Amino acid sequence: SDESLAEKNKNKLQFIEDVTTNADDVQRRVLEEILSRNADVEYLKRHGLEGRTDRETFKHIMPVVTYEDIQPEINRIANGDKSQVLCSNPISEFLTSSGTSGGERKLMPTIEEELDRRSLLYSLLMPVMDQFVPGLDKGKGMYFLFIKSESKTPGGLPARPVLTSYYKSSHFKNRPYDPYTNYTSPNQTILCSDSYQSMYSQMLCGLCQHKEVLRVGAVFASGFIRAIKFLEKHWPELARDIRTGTLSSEITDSSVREAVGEILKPDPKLADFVESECRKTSWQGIITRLWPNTKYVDVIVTGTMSQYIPTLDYYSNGLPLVCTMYASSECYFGVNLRPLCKPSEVSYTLIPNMAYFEFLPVHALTEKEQQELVDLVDVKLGQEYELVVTTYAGLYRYRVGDVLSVAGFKNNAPQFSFICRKNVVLSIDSDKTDEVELQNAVKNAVTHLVPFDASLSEYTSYADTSSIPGHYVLFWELCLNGNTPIPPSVFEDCCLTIEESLNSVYRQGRVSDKSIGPLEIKMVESGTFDKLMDYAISLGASINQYKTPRCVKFAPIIELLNSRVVDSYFSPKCPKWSPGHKQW
Ligand SMILES: Nc1ncnc2c1ncn2[C@@H]1O[C@H](COP(=O)(O)O)[C@@H](O)[C@H]1O
Numbered sequence: 001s002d003e004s005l006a007e008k009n010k011n012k013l014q015f016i017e018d019v020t021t022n023a024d025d026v027q028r029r030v031l032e033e034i035l036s037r038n039a040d041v042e043y044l045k046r047h048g049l050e051g052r053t054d055r056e057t058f059k060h061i062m063p064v065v066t067y068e069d070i071q072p073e074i075n076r077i078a079n080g081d082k083s084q085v086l087c088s089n090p091i092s093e094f095l096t097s098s099g100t101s102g103g104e105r106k107l108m109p110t111i112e113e114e115l116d117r118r119s120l121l122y123s124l125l126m127p128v129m130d131q132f133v134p135g136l137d138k139g140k141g142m143y144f145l146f147i148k149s150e151s152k153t154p155g156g157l158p159a160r161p162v163l164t165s166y167y168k169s170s171h172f173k174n175r176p177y178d179p180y181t182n183y184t185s186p187n188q189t190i191l192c193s194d195s196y197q198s199m200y201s202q203m204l205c206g207l208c209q210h211k212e213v214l215r216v217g218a219v220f221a222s223g224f225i226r227a228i229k230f231l232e233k234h235w236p237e238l239a240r241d242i243r244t245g246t247l248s249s250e251i252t253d254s255s256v257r258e259a260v261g262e263i264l265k266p267d268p269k270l271a272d273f274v275e276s277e278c279r280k281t282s283w284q285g286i287i288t289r290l291w292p293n294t295k296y297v298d299v300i301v302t303g304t305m306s307q308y309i310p311t312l313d314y315y316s317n318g319l320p321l322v323c324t325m326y327a328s329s330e331c332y333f334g335v336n337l338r339p340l341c342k343p344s345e346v347s348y349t350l351i352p353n354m355a356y357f358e359f360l361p362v363h364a365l366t367e368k369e370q371q372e373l374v375d376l377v378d379v380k381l382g383q384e385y386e387l388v389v390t391t392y393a394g395l396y397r398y399r400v401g402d403v404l405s406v407a408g409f410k411n412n413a414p415q416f417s418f419i420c421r422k423n424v425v426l427s428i429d430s431d432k433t434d435e436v437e438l439q440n441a442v443k444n445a446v447t448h449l450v451p452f453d454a455s456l457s458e459y460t461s462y463a464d465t466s467s468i469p470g471h472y473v474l475f476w477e478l479c480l481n482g483n484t485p486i487p488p489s490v491f492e493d494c495c496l497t498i499e500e501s502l503n504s505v506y507r508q509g510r511v512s513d514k515s516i517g518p519l520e521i522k523m524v525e526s527g528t529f530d531k532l533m534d535y536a537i538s539l540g541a542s543i544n545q546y547k548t549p550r551c552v553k554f555a556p557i558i559e560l561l562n563s564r565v566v567d568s569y570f571s572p573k574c575p576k577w578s579p580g581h582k583q584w
């Protein structure tokens with residue numbers, strides 16, 4: 001009912017007013033519920049909390065921790081320990097973060113109840129959007145949503161990404177009819193494990209229902225960009241399927257054929273229209289030509305995903321880019337209460353019911369620093385902080401690694417601009433390669449130069465999004481001391497050795513999802529890195545302190561390096577990758 005839908009949106013917005021006005025009390029309540037329910041868990045008992053639930057004692061007694069500090073407990077649960085180690089409720093599965101430890105996905109513990117809080121945060125998005133963009137219940141959203149590979153821990157618990165867990169749960173698969181969660185993609189196309197068949201069937205269904213589409217997107221800008229490239233490579237086949245009403249024989253999955261069969265019908269006029277738009281040389285504005293009622297593009301373009309804004313604006317002819325929420329494997333965090341703001345102005349209001357949030361000011365932690373972490377309501381405007389979380393699933397004062405800046409307040413709840421996940425230097429899609437992983441990968445690769453009496457004088461890197469999929473680029477300046485020229489096969493083996501030493505999310509991107517392309521090494525002229533040092537010296541840097549940065553994001557410096565390239569080489573094949581931790 002239209003009236004019941006209006007009342008539901010009003011009650012969700014009233015909830016936002018209530019919890020942002022009473023933010024500190026909700027924060028205190030959440031911590032009290034976590035600490036009383038888990039009072040008898042081994043982790044709290046061994047730290048001497050003795051069933052105490054007050055914030056003051058919690059901050060004084062409990063250490064602020066990294067993943068590595070609690071990895072013994074996590075691995076014990078992963079290996080079959082069913083006792084109350086971190087949580088009183090049984091750990092239902094591990095949500096495998098894109099963030100890594102030892103080059104492997106971090107295993108974030110979860111409990112079945114956490115799905116309720118993920119659904120609560122999702123339930124706030126459309127009531128917020130509907131204030132600014134009315135009438136979205138009268139059509140469909142064309143979202144490209146994907147499941148990823150799954151594995152089992154040695155103790156039998158599933159280990160899978162948070163979104164794969166969510167789409168496979170009854171909270172999504174058997175969700176009730178909501179005209180605001182009415183998507184062009186049937187559940188069976190999303191839950192298809194074959195990524196090619198999932199993408200093809202979702203793109204075909206999106207085209208079949210094109211006039212009903214009022215918004216388009218994916219969780220990541222990179223994912224949506226990949227869907228547009230898929231249409232670029234497969235539109236003649238997709239239009240043929242529309243014209244004939246027969247689904248491509250390459251879609252062998254029976255659940256996908258059945259779901260597509262309910263949408264796909266012979267439509268030569270639509271096939272003519274799809275072909276006429278896709279055949280055009282320029283794909284500028286192709287989203288608004290095929291999906292003409294699209295109001296906005298809904299994709300995360302904050303953080304590293306901001307690198308995709310020009311590509312998205314090109315395909316959409318400048319439609320609004322909407323960043324709706326901020327979340328992780330360990331905890332769903334907040335919502336953008338200004339979804340029509342510019343990408344550079346996005347701030348996320350953390351919802352105080354999700355977890356107990358603390359903030360480390362940023363300008364090994366001392367006892368004073370740990371005890372004096374700033375509470376959610378006490379953060380200061382314009383100041384930067386590291387996010388620290390205490391969840392219902394066994395994380396106590398866990399450092400997420402995200403650096404946030406206070407942009408403003410919604411009643412007493414702060415609104416944060418996302419700055420960065422600490423130490424991440426390269427990212428194309430969900431891959432988050434840090435400086436240590438890259439350095440060690442380059443160090444493994446340069447061993448191939450040693451038999452040629454050659455060495456790597458200097459290097460840097462950048463995330464190249466000029467191709468789809470995007471790829472990592474390393475700039476190398478070589479020092480040759482021998483008489484045997486280095487052949488291209490050796491540089492190609494350097495490319496592959498780098499890839500083999502990068503983390504499992506990067507290798508998964510190459511092997512499983514095809515979300516990252518082959519890594520490239522670009523050899524630069526001699527004196528190129530000394531020319532970069534001359535820029536730094538002109539801007540105040542000393543010769544005795546300057547270090548060539550491991551990574552560069554600033555376009556004019558990438559252009560400078562790109563102008564000095566002598567030759568380039570690519571990894572000739574994918575690196576190795578298999579689901580789960582190698583240890584298992
Ligand atoms: N809206 C967002 N904007 C920027 N970065 C985000 C956003 N949502 C998630 N992330 C990043 O992704 C991390 C979670 O990755 P994962 O655990 O793989 O879901 C967060 O801690 C952030 O570093």
Ligand SMILES: N[C@@H](CC(=O)O)C(=O)O
Nearest residue numbers: 097098161162163164430
């Ligand atoms: N967290 C995201 C990305 C990833 O883990 O690779 C997902 O659940 O799909």
